[PDB]
Amino acid sequence: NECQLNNLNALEPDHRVESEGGLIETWNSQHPELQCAGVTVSKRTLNRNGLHLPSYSPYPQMIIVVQGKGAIGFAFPGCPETFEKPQDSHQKIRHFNEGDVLVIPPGVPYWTYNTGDEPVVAISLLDTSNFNNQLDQNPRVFYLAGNPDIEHPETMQEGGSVLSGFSKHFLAQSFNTNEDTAEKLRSPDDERKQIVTVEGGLSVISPKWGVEENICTMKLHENIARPSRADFYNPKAGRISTLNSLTLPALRQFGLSAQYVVLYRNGIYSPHWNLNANSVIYVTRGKGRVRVVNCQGNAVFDGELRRGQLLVVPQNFVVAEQGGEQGLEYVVFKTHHNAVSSYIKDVFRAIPSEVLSNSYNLGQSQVRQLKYQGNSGPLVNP
Amino acid sequence: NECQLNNLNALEPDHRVESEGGLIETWNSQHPELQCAGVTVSKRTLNRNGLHLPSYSPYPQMIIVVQGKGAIGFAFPGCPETFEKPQDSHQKIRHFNEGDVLVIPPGVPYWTYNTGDEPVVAISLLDTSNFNNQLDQNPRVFYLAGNPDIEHPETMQEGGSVLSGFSKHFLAQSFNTNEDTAEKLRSPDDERKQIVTVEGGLSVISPKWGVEENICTMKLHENIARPSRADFYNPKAGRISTLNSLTLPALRQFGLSAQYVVLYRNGIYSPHWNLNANSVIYVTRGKGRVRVVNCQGNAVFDGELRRGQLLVVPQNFVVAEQGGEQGLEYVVFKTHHNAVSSYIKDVFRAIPSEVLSNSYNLGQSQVRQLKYQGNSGPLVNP
Amino acid sequence: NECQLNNLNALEPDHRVESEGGLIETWNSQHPELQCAGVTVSKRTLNRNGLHLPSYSPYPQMIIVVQGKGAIGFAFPGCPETFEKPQDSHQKIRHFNEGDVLVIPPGVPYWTYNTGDEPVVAISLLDTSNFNNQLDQNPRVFYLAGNPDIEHPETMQEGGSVLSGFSKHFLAQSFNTNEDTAEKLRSPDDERKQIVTVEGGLSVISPKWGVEENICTMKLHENIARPSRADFYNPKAGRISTLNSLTLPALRQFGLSAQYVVLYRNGIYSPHWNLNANSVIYVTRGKGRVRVVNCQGNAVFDGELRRGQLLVVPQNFVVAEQGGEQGLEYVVFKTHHNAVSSYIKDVFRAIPSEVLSNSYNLGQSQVRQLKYQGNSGPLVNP
Amino acid sequence: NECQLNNLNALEPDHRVESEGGLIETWNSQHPELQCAGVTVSKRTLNRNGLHLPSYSPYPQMIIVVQGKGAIGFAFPGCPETFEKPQDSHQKIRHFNEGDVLVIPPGVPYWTYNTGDEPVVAISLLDTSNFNNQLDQNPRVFYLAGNPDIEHPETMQEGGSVLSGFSKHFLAQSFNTNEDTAEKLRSPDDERKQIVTVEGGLSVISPKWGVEENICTMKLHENIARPSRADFYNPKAGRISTLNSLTLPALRQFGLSAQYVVLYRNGIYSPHWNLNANSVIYVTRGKGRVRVVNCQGNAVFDGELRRGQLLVVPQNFVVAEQGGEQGLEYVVFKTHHNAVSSYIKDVFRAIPSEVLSNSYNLGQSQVRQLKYQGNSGPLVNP
Amino acid sequence: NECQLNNLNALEPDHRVESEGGLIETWNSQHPELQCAGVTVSKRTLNRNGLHLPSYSPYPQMIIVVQGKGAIGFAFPGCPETFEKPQDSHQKIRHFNEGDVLVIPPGVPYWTYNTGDEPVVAISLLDTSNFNNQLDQNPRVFYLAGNPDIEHPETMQEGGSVLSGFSKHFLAQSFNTNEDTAEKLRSPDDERKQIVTVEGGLSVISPKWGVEENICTMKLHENIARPSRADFYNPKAGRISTLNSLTLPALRQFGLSAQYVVLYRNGIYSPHWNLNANSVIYVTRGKGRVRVVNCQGNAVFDGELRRGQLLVVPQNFVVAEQGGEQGLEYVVFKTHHNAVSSYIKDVFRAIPSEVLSNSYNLGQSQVRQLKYQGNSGPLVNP
Numbered sequence A, B, C, D, E: 001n002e003c004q005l006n007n008l009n010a011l012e013p014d015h016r017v018e019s020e021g022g023l024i025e026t027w028n029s030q031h032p033e034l035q036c037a038g039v040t041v042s043k044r045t046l047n048r049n050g051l052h053l054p055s056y057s058p059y060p061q062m063i064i065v066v067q068g069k070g071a072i073g074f075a076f077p078g079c080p081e082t083f084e085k086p087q088d089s090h091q092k093i094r095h096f097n098e099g100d101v102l103v104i105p106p107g108v109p110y111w112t113y114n115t116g117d118e119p120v121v122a123i124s125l126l127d128t129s130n131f132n133n134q135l136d137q138n139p140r141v142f143y144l145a146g147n148p149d150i151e152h153p154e155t156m157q158e159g160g161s162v163l164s165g166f167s168k169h170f171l172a173q174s175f176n177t178n179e180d181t182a183e184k185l186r187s188p189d190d191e192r193k194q195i196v197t198v199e200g201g202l203s204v205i206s207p208k209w210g211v212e213e214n215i216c217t218m219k220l221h222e223n224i225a226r227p228s229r230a231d232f233y234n235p236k237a238g239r240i241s242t243l244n245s246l247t248l249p250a251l252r253q254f255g256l257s258a259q260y261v262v263l264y265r266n267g268i269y270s271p272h273w274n275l276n277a278n279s280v281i282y283v284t285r286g287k288g289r290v291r292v293v294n295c296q297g298n299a300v301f302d303g304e305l306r307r308g309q310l311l312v313v314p315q316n317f318v319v320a321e322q323g324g325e326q327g328l329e330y331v332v333f334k335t336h337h338n339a340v341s342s343y344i345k346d347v348f349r350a351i352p353s354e355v356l357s358n359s360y361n362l363g364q365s366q367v368r369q370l371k372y373q374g375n376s377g378p379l380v381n382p
């Protein structure tokens, strides 16, 4: 019964956590649309010099940066620290800017920092139903530092880092340190919350600013937005770009992929469905008309989606979008490492003339212009 | 608790949809046996010149044709139309006849047509619990044409094609057509339902009647019934044939396999269980005695199964069948791409003489005739 | 230097072994063309009631049966004897007829027998350059019975079975039998050679005349010639069928795949090349004009190819075929498990109209007519 | 015997092909070093408005672009033309610039075009010894247009395109065009050679100037030179980036990977070796002192390597590089999809202090200083 | 031509390197038998307190320890030092004893040390023809310390360690050490050779004397000789154990597998052949009568094989062994990760009684006794 949805809604963030250095806004995971899709979303904003403290979660996250630029560090287990300075050593620092997609592995700690003047804004698809999460479907975030406010409040009906749950004496014995250091490790009077502000700026070792050439240095980010990455293009209607496991191989293990589409003013992304994955659309710019149809032939969504709105398009449901006067830009997260979609102009080319005539009571003259007259692709300029 | 079944029943079709060109009969997916197995079944009949209109579903189906012959066309996404005629072009048309098994990929559109004089009869295993279905366990069928009656009525407590959910104006703009054509695409006064009748006959391009040598032309059908395909044979007891991923490689992605067994008059398919898959038996001809035993040692099915009846044999439960006076023929769908079974005569050969004596309080004289005296295989002539 | 060949020849068999119940005609493996492809061919003929005695070779061979019908039996190591008669038992018997392709695994013993009236004619591609062959490019055939004449005598500069190299005494000890029997296993004064006649007939356990549901019963044959198997078709030019590892899974481990093409009177299989494999054409029926071009633009072969003839088309060389008065039919063996080709009409479609213009000094309109006119597939009807 | 080389030389190009819109300079594939590595190199130059005409080769080539920017277009067999203009349509256009690496698949046609003012300089590693090449180690380049001079003439002891080997008549029939057009496809009196100038400019469909979301749109390029891509870094010595199949998945099927290292003034990339691959260094900027040692402890190479020079370091031979007055930058191509190296400082850490003592007659304290002092990574700042 | 050998010889070591703490005896890699198999062998001996100094080679070697016990230590690139003492730290120490097989990866440094009183004797199969070796068939051994005599001098027509090819100055800079230490790393006047004696004893961190839970700690050894490991057994004839990639996963990447067979007084390992691999027998104890037959039915080897002797049995050649007065024990190395054999008693069972009759002119009853009498397994007790 989870996906027997009679109506679908254009959802915006329910909860908000203001922090010293930024802001986290979450969608409620209990919305029926998001339960069908088996995911929840989170919008994070890091202000200038904002440092999102190190954390991890038991499921993968696919994040698209829609504004600003910064650095992300992951702490891979037992991998060497290949960045060193004759003194501090640490692992590889990766740089991102807008249009990039980042992928966080299950259980791997990560931290991000805002490198520019403007605030970094990023929306994250928390894939809680992924086969790699062996707990349950509730969103969870384990923090290694600070005293964080609850990000997904609905999982309950301020908290602590995983280090505050241990005593300063066992932490002193455990990390061979003095009890004064051990005491600060459990963040006793920290009110900054999970995204702090680094005064003066942060300085880490980086060119742009053991060995292991294999797993310890795996690519975990790729740009999806830049115009030249288009896989489909019609200069009068728009462009589509696909990011999947053939581009970013780690996605084969996390089960996610994504598309970035851009529709020009009045451009149609004609009737289509995803064959093997649920999708989650997040509009990054503009507005336009979207119509989703289920198996009974009923439109379960029929209206305008606009910037800041989220819309779930379940597997096999037929979608169709059209950019408005300002055009429409959005990212589509899909829950498959290699999600494939299909569009109806293409299904008509593939079917014999006569089963098309007999199916829609069309003449050969009409089947022939359906089949060969366009605008072969999915992007239509009307 | 889903598979803690105290009794199992020989099930026959609950619902029926009569159509112009044929008939669909479905088993209720809520029967407790079918819920344990995570599947439901459907029996489709296409009368002479019957055309099952194009549709797709979010899970794979494994179909065995038990009568007649026809053609099946699939519409694979972005693959070239390799059948062309100097004018109509379309994809590869595949031919089937009785004894064949067809496999429908998740989300891929397909249509079938009756090519002979007699009606085509086919029973389909709708694998709704497959990892590829990301919606929910309800059976769903999305139709690209016509106005279809509800095939699995129980999912609710006549419908439309996915194209009727869009307006004729957006369909005209979308497929670059005139509104008159766009109007027929949404099947406004079609009462023929999902299996129509093609008057005079259908004519598609076919010998018997881009490139892509890889994925676009993948084998999606294999005969399982013909006598010569037997993998096991005893001329006095019967034959067994296995169809799995080593024969049809696409099955590795859809998680199904099947066997076809034929028992001669009084032939026994002695005590056996499936190690890693639930099974669903559908009797195609004859009748015979079947006894299923659970882990408590109780017979949860003990009677005669006969043509038209369905029986679920859960994983690890011990089955044993015997053909009657007319013999017994059936197909067994299993929910694993390479399902393996094991029979007890073979387990006795594998166990040391003395753990067999100590286990059943047998003498060496008795263990030795158990171990070496037969009729080595699973088919016994009594 | 082996594929730096400025001329290519249409080859016929060189040697001939006459047997009691058949004939074998081989192609010399020292021909430059055959050495480039790293393969050699052998045409076997089994007369009525002809039994080709059990044998194995250290490389895989792909065989197309061009006339007759028969049975083949393999002897897989350690697999159970699933065919039994309550008195003999043996492994699965497979049946074949014209149009079927058969794959014989490295080191697996096999025997064939003619079941029809007419002789079985089969041409076999021995892939001596295969990674599975750890000996050397010389064709080797190890016989388990009889006294065979060497089929490929070139790679030597009569013999016995492998059991004749053992004394009758040791063989009697080894198989726990008497000396009369151990002596007959050496084939002492057997002058029938490798293919014998079975007077009366051969009768084995078959429907049409332990486990393994997996590996011991793997599919080793598949029909490629039948019209309905066509993957590409134009009713005015001909058809092409592809047999690769997506159809027959064993092929992935053996490195072979094939095509069967049929061209009708004056049908053109327009200019094309194989991206990743060398191929060997064998004409099974008809006559046509074949052309092969190398990297210097030189037609290394330009003439008629008729039935019985063999032509090697090396990897990446551009071939084109045209059907004669009565059409042209041929099987193409390729040395890759999933061999892909490309045809030039199709690459013109893939390239921007302006690099085509600048490449061949063509006008916008002439480029326009090549890209979009025609005949979209590789089969052209002139 | 091919890698039993007691001397190694820094190599420069031997031959030169002058074209209308560019230049090609090749390294003779008969040099002993190049023969050990089973590869040969080619430096291509496209002047402004230079179009390298469509061509394919039977092996993969990895290309690093060291100057300029341009567009590349591949022609994948059977894939749809997803870029379209309502009048041309063609496959995806990819853009590149300095620092990018590009992989050209076996048998896939490609063309490039210069989009900047300055010339594009690219050095290409032709991996003729690749398992995908079923012809022989001779470099082959099959052109679809023009009259090319042989780029690698050594492996022969001007030519035409592959279409010139066909008559204008058959080509007119084959592609359903007139003789005027069929004649121009042969490139009859074209003296421009393989790289032509496009007067005015080339204009194709691009954003920045059916499906497949999968295979037809696979990533074939990736930036390796940019500072931010560093995998190893020491701000006082230099950086190293690795490009392998965990970053670009196509590489797993082609057997290639690469590194880009930058050493600053006197920076040492301390003694190391590749465990599983031969490599080819090409200096892109600067000068440094390179040392290579074989299994006898003999420095087979010990001198300066400067820009434009090529040095082969065979598998397992220990190399060490030191940056000159102005540093040293170079790309290292390796013949494994995931090539791993090891550096000696790191193996000292892995070995017990006492086998190090007994191995080099060192005292506990000197062993102690080697294991734990320094500079932990491979880049040493002296 | 390399495996077209009409005679096979039982081989003994040719060369001998005397060291301070051990001995190495090699087999000449130029023997025709060894060249057919593409391997060469080396018998190493470490006397009490013998340390074989750290070394690597570009191919994998499989080693069976036939006497003594010791410790081996590998140095995996970039892996953490998980054994530590609060003062040294190093990678995991593995212990071995007689009957164990060890696999040394391509390019991975290793050292061994004798921990018992008696000498460790180990015979190593160097697989120079391995796909992982990108240099050439000449055995290479790169030493990180000492001055070694060449173990395989045939493949050359004393030396130093790889660090001696570097000056003491650069080595001092590279590893941030003084010149006294950089100088001792070159091994200047070390006359002990590759295996030294450790006076007093060697003491490393071991229980019995970062992460990686995965790759850095992979299993590289496994006991094959112990009676309880038998895979086949007949108490009146002997036993056979198989070690392949289903037991030790690393082997799948190295192409090697092995067997250990023990025949008791007059036990026969009846006629058999390897389907997919060449093998090298080394007798570890006893004496027996070995027979090898080629494809012409000629016994290329027919005589006694005794302890210390080596015999190459090429792929598909039929071998048979019989134990002497005191039995016969031997290890068989095979050049496939999962090598399969077949024995003739078993193929008689797989074949129909009537093709056996016609094949060897046997009567129904004699065929009957071969198929079902005996001794079902490969070990026959006469």
Ligand SMILES: [Mg+2]
Residues within 6 Å of the ligand: A319, A332
């Ligand atoms: Mg969409």
Ligand SMILES: [Mg+2]
Residues within 6 Å of the ligand: B319, B332
């Ligand atoms: Mg059953």
Ligand SMILES: [Mg+2]
Residues within 6 Å of the ligand: C319, C332
């Ligand atoms: Mg051809």
Ligand SMILES: [Mg+2]
Residues within 6 Å of the ligand: D319, D332
């Ligand atoms: Mg280097």
Ligand SMILES: [Mg+2]
Residues within 6 Å of the ligand: E319, E332
């Ligand atoms: Mg043996």
